[PDB]
Amino acid sequence: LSLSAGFDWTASIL
Amino acid sequence: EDISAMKNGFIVVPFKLPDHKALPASLHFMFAKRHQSSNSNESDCLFLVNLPLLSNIEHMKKFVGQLCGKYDTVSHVEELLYNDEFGLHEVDLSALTSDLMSSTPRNTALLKFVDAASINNCWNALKKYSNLHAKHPNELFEWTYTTPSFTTFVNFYKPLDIDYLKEDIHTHMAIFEQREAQAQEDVQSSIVDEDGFTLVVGKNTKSLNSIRKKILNKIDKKAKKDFYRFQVRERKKQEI
Amino acid sequence: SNIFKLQIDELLEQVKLKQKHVLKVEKFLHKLYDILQEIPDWEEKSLAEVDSFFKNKIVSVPFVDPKPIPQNTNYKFNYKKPDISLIGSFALKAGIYQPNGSSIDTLLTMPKELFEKKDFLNFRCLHKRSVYLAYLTHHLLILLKKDKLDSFLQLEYSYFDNDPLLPILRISCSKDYNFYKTRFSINLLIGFPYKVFEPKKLLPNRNCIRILPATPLYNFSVLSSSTHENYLKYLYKTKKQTESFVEATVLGRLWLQQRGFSSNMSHSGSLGGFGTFEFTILMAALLNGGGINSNKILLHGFSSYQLFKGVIKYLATMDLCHDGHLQFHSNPASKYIDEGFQTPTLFDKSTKVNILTKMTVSSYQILKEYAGETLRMLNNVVQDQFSNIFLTNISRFDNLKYDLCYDVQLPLGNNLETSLAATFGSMERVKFITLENFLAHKITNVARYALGDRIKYIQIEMVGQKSDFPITKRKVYSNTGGNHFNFDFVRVKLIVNPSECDKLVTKGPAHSETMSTEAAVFKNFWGIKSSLRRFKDGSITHCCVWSTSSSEPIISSIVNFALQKHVSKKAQISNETIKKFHNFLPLPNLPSSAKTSVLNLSSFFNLKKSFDDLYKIIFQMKLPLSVKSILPVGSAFRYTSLCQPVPFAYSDPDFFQDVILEFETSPKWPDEITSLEKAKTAFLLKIQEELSANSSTYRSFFSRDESIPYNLEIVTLNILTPEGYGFKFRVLTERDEILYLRAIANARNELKPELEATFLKFTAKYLASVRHTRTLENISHSYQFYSPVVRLFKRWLDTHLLLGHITDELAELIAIKPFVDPAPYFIPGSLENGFLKVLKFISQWNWKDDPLILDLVKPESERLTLAQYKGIQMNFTNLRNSDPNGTHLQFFVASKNDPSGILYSSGIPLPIATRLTALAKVAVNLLQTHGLNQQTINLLFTPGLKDYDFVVDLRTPIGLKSSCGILSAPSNFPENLNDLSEKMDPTYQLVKYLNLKYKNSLILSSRKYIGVNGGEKGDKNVITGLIKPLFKGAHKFRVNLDCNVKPVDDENVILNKEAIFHEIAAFGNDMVINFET
């Protein structure tokens, strides 16, 4: 397995 | 596929991509229009958009070559102006810092031809070339992407020839010193206007362009609040 | 101060309990008191009769080990009405809302007639109280049934403060009297009347278990059990005299809880023993004195802030365990005595009770450390520290708190081996009532003594220890224990001391003609490992010698050998989490690399010695302008290169190390940029010339640099040093800086933002770069573990294809934050603790509203003052005012070197910046969901690679791992310097150029180091791309589209993905292997 993070282009994760 | 010309007027010029094992009929398209400009250097030019990687004049010399053979038209491309695939020459830092030695969109360039007879010949060939994709895509030309310039660019880590640098450095200083010498004499030569006004130049000044830029770049304390009769009368007025 | 005071108030109101639940529970236990009043009395019973009376009942008494046997239980048992009373924080109304939940303590005082004077001997008072609890449970249960409350009440025993000798009945509500929503827990405390037993007989020095050795733990248990209501009364008087007592009380309980400190027992192994009533009783003791002169240290007029500050200062600097103890009178000014009892002691002369008996020696040092480091933060005026002090839980992860953690699996774990049980013996049962108390003490002494100065603090935790057991059972039952030992396994946690953690030899007592006692304990403890050695100084001392390894620290070997020899030869000691992190760091291809410690910078010292040889050469060389200085500005010079330098390993990206050369100031420098830089190459061209003549053993060649935009005349001289190291030289001159300023002034208003960016990169390489090495190199020493963690941190970025967009210096500034700003944690002292701390910070860093500013200074000048602090804060607000969303700038990293704060964090795309926080968040979540273990670490260091829109695989013609100096190899430079490129990886340069052409449409990234993250042979690298939202969908066709597209309609185009793949393939040539879209 791996660490995979959905790519965010609006700085929403922050 | 049926598309031949863009409504704004940029003719679509398809290109066939290579057979590479990593990439197992993918194409690449240009958008082109006749360029009009009163400037002599920009006259007789063809405006191109969406250029492939590292598209030099030698590439242009090829493709006009097959177009000439296929359509039996005489066309010669003199040069490719404003080819900045990496935007590297967008600003001339030499011009901004000083005038000596340098009196001076993106993903597009201007293709100059030798004469008007060549460019209109190419444009007629280009219109026919566009029609091919709708009818016969198989006969579409193939872009090489391999050129002597490409190999030099690919070989990023190449030690520079010291002998070539030695000559290039020597010529550049020889020219610069001559220009610097001429500039310093010009400022300190007792410049007098047409009407007899002598310009002033400070010592150690080297360039008249510098003097101009300084100009572009660039009583209250001795007034006495209590000296005149009206000044104490008003002081007396505010005193009471 | 007013900012803090208001911050105090906001915290109190936020956590303040909702008064409605007070009425709800007050409605219940008031009625519970009536149920107690119904319970009937009992007659005198022997153990035989009570056993029969309880034989068939569901209830079973919680007899404390050793259970009373018929022979020694001759004393009879009886029950009578107790005097019900309410005790605890609820009594003081200092209680709060706790999401995990609070407890209500109710005391039932046995009538004194149930006691004899000599009942504090041989657990006599203990066992009659035990049946007293059982008789209550039997009648309370049936009465609970009669009133019909049993539907939503669950009853069980539990140990008071995890004290095995004080089981208590614990009452809860499961989902009108239903108090489940209140989340409060009524605990019935079965305590003795006041002065039933002579307290002088119950002093810590005295004994009460006949077998003589003292019994401090039992003496406290019965005496403290007999002294509850008195401390209750003692605390109210103080509550009235000082108005801010309750406020001061609630501030500490935060600070206790965030550090994970409780009132529970600590000899068992759990960290605690200092709770609220320890916190409060220290207040009351201090409010009536506390100084050596018996002067008041705290005044009743003090506010909540001052009351809290005094105790933190009081505990931080005065020692209560080894040298000095405090005495006070609950019923007389408190005075600090210089003598110490070698254990945490707060004597109470009025009650003859030591309140810190449950407080262990090892935990006390950690308490003293925590108070001191907060006192430094409390005195801090530059930075606000409210959130760190009170609103940051460090107790979530043991790894983040504690540098090294070792789990010890004891043998035969349905009872411990006969040898281990035999070691417990009868004498230690008197000293330590339970084997868990003794065994925990056994581990601490041998571990503390074995490691000695190598560690600062040690904690032993009995993992899987329970404190509550059903009504049907007499003692707690562990699945591994089998009623024998209430724990699953022991975990040994350390705070290492970096200065001497890796010492090869453990120094000991000096030799003497007669073998001294300290030498006696020396030779016996380490046994064959103990022996006698001599040194260069001529001293003859008993010392034992260990072997360094690159996979585990020296502490690994010491604990394994020390515990096995003394504790149990069958013990299994393992810490694999350290070993994986150590292995992830690249192993250099130098002699004895495996045996080299991770704290050894031997590879780095060798590099500058070769530079020093070149340093002497350049200076004596005659040039038109004298050399001002030669300044090394490299990564290996600051001890941050991911892979350590290796001779002749020129495939390493960091092999050619940048150095700044500056000459004497002259007025003859060209006034034009290109002539200046060409004049620089002429100076370098000389440096190459007579260097070749005078020193032929040095080899040289020239290369072009394009890092500074629009300055294409930069030529750097690469010198291949005979020891096998490469150095890159660039010339610096005063006129160079002002010419860039001239360009910005002359540039058109639209072009000025572009030119200042060019100046920003220039100062990042020439001006600010020099300062960055100077501070970090000096700052690196005392922070021994900063160099490994930043290297491993850099490794983590490379695996996830993030170094291509993050400049090397930014990775260092983010990685040093846990060291310069360790609060609320300690300075990292191990590779995993530091690295996880870096990931923790990035996860919780809100870079849009919170700036990062660091004091690059040594541990307690150049510290940021108030004026400098507010100036940088002013800068962050101004930039965020123009850039609220943070699209242009994401990370604001500033310091004295970089007051602007945008020097090393400019140009990073917003997508990548979110990856660093997004990946960091998931990594923290992964650690929470699954504990730190081999599988988790392997996940942390492997890239998903699926979210990327298209992925391109590449393989180099030859493996580069050997030429990178990495041990799974060249010994000289090639005769033709053209051959260097044949053994190098161009993919980093391939991606750099492709981004710029596709800057408006695509974001391509790749692994900078291919020898480390390119498999076994180090040739596999991957180019991963991303299509922006705008060009992903169709667009109307325009000249400014600035993208490679395909027409779909007469005025519509779509991205040309297939040709971009072909464009990448031709650009990659034979390296590209496959395309995944």
Q: What is the DSSP string of C817-858?
A: HHHHS-TTSPPP-SHHHHHHHHHHHHHH--TTT--EE-----
Q: Where are the CATH 3.30.70.3030 domain residues in chain C?
A: 946-1077
Phi first, then psi: what are they for B134, rounded to 5°?
-65, -40
Q: From C916, which residue of chain A is nearest by alpha-carbon distance?
A: A5
Q: Check residue C87 and give left, alpha or beta (phi > 0: left; psi -120 to 50: alpha).
A: beta
Distance CA C434, CA C157 (A): 18
Q: Is C919 within 8 Å of chain A by CB?
A: yes
Strand C346-348 versus strand C325-328 pairing type: parallel
Distance CA C702, CA B159 (A): 6
Model resolution, angstroms? 5.9
Radius of gyration of chain A (CA): 9
SS3 C214: coil
Q: Do A3 and C886 touch (CB under 8 A)?
A: no
Residue B169: half-sphere exposure toward Cβ, Cα within 13 Å: 21
Instruction: Locate C920 and state its tokens.
Output: 């960091």
Residues 6+ apart with CB under 8 A from C775: C856, C896, C897
Distance CA C880, CA C416 (A): 63
Q: Where are the CATH 3.30.70.3020 domain residues in chain C?
A: 398-504+548-574
Residues of C with Cβ-Cβ distance to A14 under 8 angstroms = 846-848, 886, 914, 917
Largest CA distance in chain A: 27
Q: From C718, which residue of chain B is nearest by alpha-carbon distance?
A: B159
User: Helices marked H in C527-631 — which ranges?
Assistant: 554-566, 576-584, 602-620
Q: Are C158 and C77 in contact (CB under 8 A)?
A: no
SS3 C189: strand
Chain-centroid distance, C-alpha C343: 27
Residue C384 distance to chain B (closest CA, Å): 44
Question: How crowded is residue C482: how many other Cβ atoms within 10 Å of its Cβ?
Answer: 11
Distance CA C239, CA C233 (A): 10
Distance CA C67, CA C346 (A): 32
Q: Are C442 and C567 in contact (CB under 8 A)?
A: yes
> Residue holding tokens 């007999």?
C226
SS3 C701: strand
Distance CA C347, CA C334 (A): 10
SS3 C116: coil
Q: In chain C, what is the straight-line distance between the N-terminal and C-terminal CA atoms, in Å?
A: 59
Q: Check residue C260 and give left, alpha or beta (phi > 0: left; psi -120 to 50: alpha).
A: left
Give the angle subtended at the CA of C897 by the CAs of C896 and C902, to the nearest 5°. Answer: 100
Distance CA C991, CA C1064 (A): 9
- State the best of C888, C914, C924, C934 to mutate against chain A, taking most chain A CBs within 10 Å: C914
Question: What distances in angstroms separate CA C47 from CA C15, C54, C59, C111, C157, one per listed residue?
Answer: 49, 10, 15, 20, 21
Distance CA C886, CA C848 (A): 6
User: Domain C1-16+192-201+242-397: which CATH class?
Assistant: mainly alpha
Residues 6+ apart with CB under 8 A from C371: C312, C313, C315, C316
User: Smallest Cα–Cα separation from B59: which of B83, B35, B36, B39?
Assistant: B83
Q: Are C454 and C497 in contact (CB under 8 A)?
A: yes
Distance CA B3, CA B8 (A): 13
Residue C496's identity, in one-letter code, is V
- State the best of B10, B54, B93, B104 to mutate against chain C, taking most chain C CBs within 10 Å: B93
Question: What distances in angstroms separate CA C101 from CA C183, C184, C258, C377, C469, one per listed residue?
Answer: 5, 6, 15, 30, 19
- State the best of C700, C1039, C1069 to mutate against chain B, taking most chain B CBs within 10 Å: C1039
In DSSP terms, C1035 is beta-bridged to C1053
Distance CA C463, CA C516 (A): 39
- Strand order, beta sheet including C572-574: C455-463, C489-496, C404-409, C572-574
Q: Are C1030 and C1043 in contact (CB under 8 A)?
A: no
Distance CA C1055, CA C1057 (A): 6
Residues of B with Cβ-Cβ distance to C1073 under 8 angstroms = 22
Q: Do C926 and A3 touch (CB under 8 A)?
A: yes
Q: Do B159 and C989 touch (CB under 8 A)?
A: no
Q: In chain B, what is the straight-line distance between the N-terminal and C-terminal CA atoms, in Å?
A: 95
Instruction: Give the method of determination.
Output: cryo-EM
Give the angle subtended at the CA of C602 by the CAs of C597 and C605, to the nearest 5°. Answer: 155
Residue C933 distance to chain A (closest CA, Å): 14
Residue C875: half-sphere exposure toward Cβ, Cα within 13 Å: 19
Q: Are B48 and B28 in contact (CB under 8 A)?
A: no
The H-or-E segment that residue C496 falls in is: strand C489-496
Q: Looking at C78-149, which runs of residues are DSSP E strands?
A: 83-87, 104-109
Q: Are C367 and C321 in contact (CB under 8 A)?
A: no
Q: Are C657 and C727 in contact (CB under 8 A)?
A: yes
Query: Nearest by CB to B176, which of C670, C702, C1051?
Result: C670
Phi first, then psi: what are they for C952, rounded to 5°?
-120, 125
Residues 6+ apart with CB under 8 A from C39: C81, C136, C139, C140, C143
Q: In chain A, what is the straight-line distance between the N-terminal and C-terminal CA atoms, in Å?
A: 25
Q: Looking at C225-383, which runs of residues are DSSP E strands?
A: 325-328, 335-337, 346-348, 353-354
What letter does residue B18 receive in the DSSP assignment?
P
Query: Chain C neighbours among A 1-14 (CB < 8 Å)?
Result: 1-9, 11, 13-14
Residue C1031's identity, in one-letter code, is F
Show the 3-state SS of C289-306: EECCCCCECCCCCCCHHH
Q: Do C918 and A13 touch (CB under 8 A)?
A: yes
Distance CA C671, CA C668 (A): 9
Distance CA C258, CA C249 (A): 15
Q: Check residue C483 and give left, alpha or beta (phi > 0: left; psi -120 to 50: alpha).
A: left
Residue C992 distance to chain A (closest CA, Å): 21
Question: How crowded is residue C352: how many other Cβ atoms within 10 Å of its Cβ?
Answer: 18
User: Helices marked H in chain B — which ranges?
Assistant: 57-71, 93-97, 116-135, 148-154, 162-187, 208-217, 229-239
In DSSP terms, C953 is beta-bridged to C1022, C1074
- Strand order, beta sheet including C346-348: C335-337, C325-328, C346-348, C353-354
Phi first, then psi: what are they for C843, rounded to 5°?
-65, -40
Question: What distances in angstroms separate CA C282 from CA B33, C59, C493, one per listed residue?
Answer: 88, 40, 28
User: Smallest Cα–Cα separation from C444: which of C265, C267, C213?
Assistant: C267
Instruction: Locate B77 and state its tokens.
Output: 């491309």
Q: Are C963 and C1012 in contact (CB under 8 A)?
A: no
Distance CA C1077, CA C1070 (A): 19
Distance CA C568, CA C554 (A): 21
Burial code of C408-431, b = ≥16 C-beta within 10 A, e = fewer?
bebeebeebeeebeebbeeebbbb
Residues of C with Cβ-Cβ distance to A9 under 8 angstroms = 910-911, 914, 1028-1029
User: Smallest Cα–Cα separation from C893: which of C854, C849, C843, C920?
Assistant: C854
Q: Do B8 and C1051 touch (CB under 8 A)?
A: yes
Q: Do C671 and B50 touch (CB under 8 A)?
A: no
Distance CA C683, CA C705 (A): 16
Sign, Cα dihedral of C792, C797, C800, C801: negative
In DSSP terms, C1076 is beta-bridged to C951
Distance CA C795, CA C1008 (A): 10
SS3 C808: helix
Show the 3-state SS of C860-890: CCCCCCHHHHHHHHHHHHHHHHHCCCCCCCC
Residue C575's identity, in one-letter code, is N
Question: What distances in angstroms separate CA B72 from CA B58, B67, B91, B115, B119, one per listed residue?
Answer: 20, 8, 41, 17, 14
Q: Do C946 and A4 touch (CB under 8 A)?
A: yes
Burial code of C816-836, b = ≥16 C-beta within 10 A, e = fewer?
bbbbbbebbbbbbbbbbbbbb
Q: Looking at C710-839, which runs of residues are DSSP E strands?
A: 715-720, 726-732
Q: From B55, which residue of chain C is nearest by alpha-carbon distance?
A: C1063
The H-or-E segment that residue B81 falls in is: strand B77-81
| A and C: number of Cβ contacts within 8 A | 60
Phi first, then psi: what are they for C288, rounded to 5°?
-115, 20
Residues of A with Cβ-Cβ distance to C923 under 8 angstroms = 3
CATH domain C398-504+548-574 topology: Alpha-Beta Plaits (3.30.70)
SS3 C3: helix
Distance CA B87, CA C857 (A): 42
Distance CA C541, CA C510 (A): 4
Residue B67 distance to chain C (closest CA, Å): 22
Question: How crowded is residue B178: how many other Cβ atoms within 10 Å of its Cβ?
Answer: 11
Strand C335-337 versus strand C353-354 pairing type: unpaired
Residue C690 distance to chain B (closest CA, Å): 14
Residue C570 distance to chain A (closest CA, Å): 35
Q: Are C1042 and B107 in contact (CB under 8 A)?
A: yes
Distance CA B221, CA B230 (A): 19
The neighbours of chain A, by the rule of 3 or more Cβ pairs under 8 Å, are C
Q: Looking at C221-313, which runs of residues are DSSP E strands?
A: none
> Residue holding tokens 């032993």?
C460
Q: Options 3.30.365.10, 3.40.50.720, 3.30.70.3030, 3.40.50.150; which CATH number does C946-1077 get?
A: 3.30.70.3030
- State the best of C754, C984, C1062 to mutate against chain B, taking most chain B CBs within 10 Å: C1062
Distance CA B109, CA B57 (A): 11
Instruction: Locate B182 and state its tokens.
Output: 């001429």
Q: Is C529 within 8 Å of chain A by CB?
A: no
> Which domains does chain B carry?
1-114 (no CATH), 115-174 (6.10.250.2760)
Distance CA C437, CA C1008 (A): 53
Q: Do A13 and C847 touch (CB under 8 A)?
A: no
